[PDB]
Enzyme design. Structure first.
Site, PDB file in Angstrom:
ATOM      1  N   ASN A 168    -138.453 -70.680  84.127  1.00  0.00           N
ATOM      2  CA  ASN A 168    -137.365 -69.712  83.917  1.00  0.00           C
ATOM      3  C   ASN A 168    -137.518 -68.792  82.706  1.00  0.00           C
ATOM      4  O   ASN A 168    -138.082 -69.178  81.661  1.00  0.00           O
ATOM      5  CB  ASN A 168    -136.036 -70.474  83.760  1.00  0.00           C
ATOM      6  CG  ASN A 168    -134.860 -69.593  84.114  1.00  0.00           C
ATOM      7  OD1 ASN A 168    -134.034 -69.242  83.048  1.00  0.00           O
ATOM      8  ND2 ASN A 168    -134.567 -69.250  85.242  1.00  0.00           N
ATOM      9  N   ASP A 205    -127.871 -65.388  87.738  1.00  0.00           N
ATOM     10  CA  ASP A 205    -127.445 -65.184  86.346  1.00  0.00           C
ATOM     11  C   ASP A 205    -128.356 -64.160  85.656  1.00  0.00           C
ATOM     12  O   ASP A 205    -128.256 -63.928  84.436  1.00  0.00           O
ATOM     13  CB  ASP A 205    -127.501 -66.528  85.590  1.00  0.00           C
ATOM     14  CG  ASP A 205    -128.910 -66.994  85.370  1.00  0.00           C
ATOM     15  OD1 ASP A 205    -129.789 -66.747  86.413  1.00  0.00           O
ATOM     16  OD2 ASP A 205    -129.304 -67.607  84.391  1.00  0.00           O
ATOM     17  N   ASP A 241    -137.460 -66.806  88.098  1.00  0.00           N
ATOM     18  CA  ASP A 241    -138.352 -67.962  88.035  1.00  0.00           C
ATOM     19  C   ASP A 241    -139.759 -67.462  88.343  1.00  0.00           C
ATOM     20  O   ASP A 241    -139.962 -66.645  89.273  1.00  0.00           O
ATOM     21  CB  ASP A 241    -137.874 -69.043  89.048  1.00  0.00           C
ATOM     22  CG  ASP A 241    -136.670 -69.773  88.544  1.00  0.00           C
ATOM     23  OD1 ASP A 241    -136.077 -69.510  87.508  1.00  0.00           O
ATOM     24  OD2 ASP A 241    -136.256 -70.642  89.262  1.00  0.00           O
ATOM     25  N   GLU A 301    -141.715 -76.122  95.054  1.00  0.00           N
ATOM     26  CA  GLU A 301    -141.228 -75.093  94.119  1.00  0.00           C
ATOM     27  C   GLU A 301    -141.799 -73.708  94.435  1.00  0.00           C
ATOM     28  O   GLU A 301    -141.053 -72.705  94.481  1.00  0.00           O
ATOM     29  CB  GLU A 301    -141.617 -75.428  92.659  1.00  0.00           C
ATOM     30  CG  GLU A 301    -140.492 -75.369  91.600  1.00  0.00           C
ATOM     31  CD  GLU A 301    -140.886 -75.921  90.186  1.00  0.00           C
ATOM     32  OE1 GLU A 301    -141.932 -75.659  89.674  1.00  0.00           O
ATOM     33  OE2 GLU A 301    -139.953 -76.615  89.760  1.00  0.00           O
ATOM     34  N   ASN A 329    -132.352 -65.760  90.291  1.00  0.00           N
ATOM     35  CA  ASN A 329    -131.249 -66.723  90.310  1.00  0.00           C
ATOM     36  C   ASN A 329    -130.174 -65.660  90.159  1.00  0.00           C
ATOM     37  O   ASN A 329    -130.481 -64.474  89.926  1.00  0.00           O
ATOM     38  CB  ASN A 329    -131.441 -67.747  89.168  1.00  0.00           C
ATOM     39  CG  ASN A 329    -132.772 -68.457  89.273  1.00  0.00           C
ATOM     40  OD1 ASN A 329    -133.811 -67.891  88.548  1.00  0.00           O
ATOM     41  ND2 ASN A 329    -132.991 -69.422  89.975  1.00  0.00           N
ATOM     42  N   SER A 356    -131.574 -64.186  85.471  1.00  0.00           N
ATOM     43  CA  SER A 356    -132.845 -64.863  85.219  1.00  0.00           C
ATOM     44  C   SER A 356    -133.696 -64.856  86.489  1.00  0.00           C
ATOM     45  O   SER A 356    -133.181 -64.683  87.614  1.00  0.00           O
ATOM     46  CB  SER A 356    -132.606 -66.292  84.766  1.00  0.00           C
ATOM     47  OG  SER A 356    -132.899 -67.231  85.798  1.00  0.00           O
TER      48      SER A 356
END
Length: 129
Positions: A59, A48, A52, A35, A46, A50
């Site tokens: 998120n 959209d 991380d 990750e 990402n 958002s």
């Protein structure tokens, strides 16, 4: 901070995660490796809007606020930035929430595709735990 395999294991353990909701310590070291590469300062956008954050890539559309994701529910009640600190306390604390809601560690794309159903104990082989 960029954690060592062993060192993170030890720390996640210290922090209540070995078998939390029934996931072996290894399930956690594994997810974190793939990750974020043990790097707490990691971030990723990402599509959209958002982003991380941290070792466990939590998120911002749901868990934490970073002040530029609109849909945003801050269920963890922490600024995203908090999740990038060298102390993983905030990230664990929040990760506990994520994993308990309903989908287990499926909530983490990478665990599901690269960790799930592999001998995850191999991640804590060698460790004083």
């Amino acid at each position: 901070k960029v954690f060592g395999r062993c060192e993170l294991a030890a720390a996640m353990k210290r922090h209540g995660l070995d078998n939390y909701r029934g996931y072996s310590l290894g399930n956690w070291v594994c997810a974190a490796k793939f990750e974020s590469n043990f790097n707490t300062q990691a971030t990723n956008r990402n599509t959209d809007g958002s982003t991380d954050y941290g070792i466990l890539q939590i998120n911002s559309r749901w868990w934490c606020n970073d002040g530029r994701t609109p849909g945003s529910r801050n269920l963890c009640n922490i600024p995203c930035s908090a999740l990038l600190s060298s102390d993983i306390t905030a990230s664990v604390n929040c990760a506990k929430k994520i994993v308990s809601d309903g989908n287990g560690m499926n909530a983490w794309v990478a665990w599901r595709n690269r960790c799930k159903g592999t001998d995850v104990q191999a991640w804590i082989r060698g460790c004083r735990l």
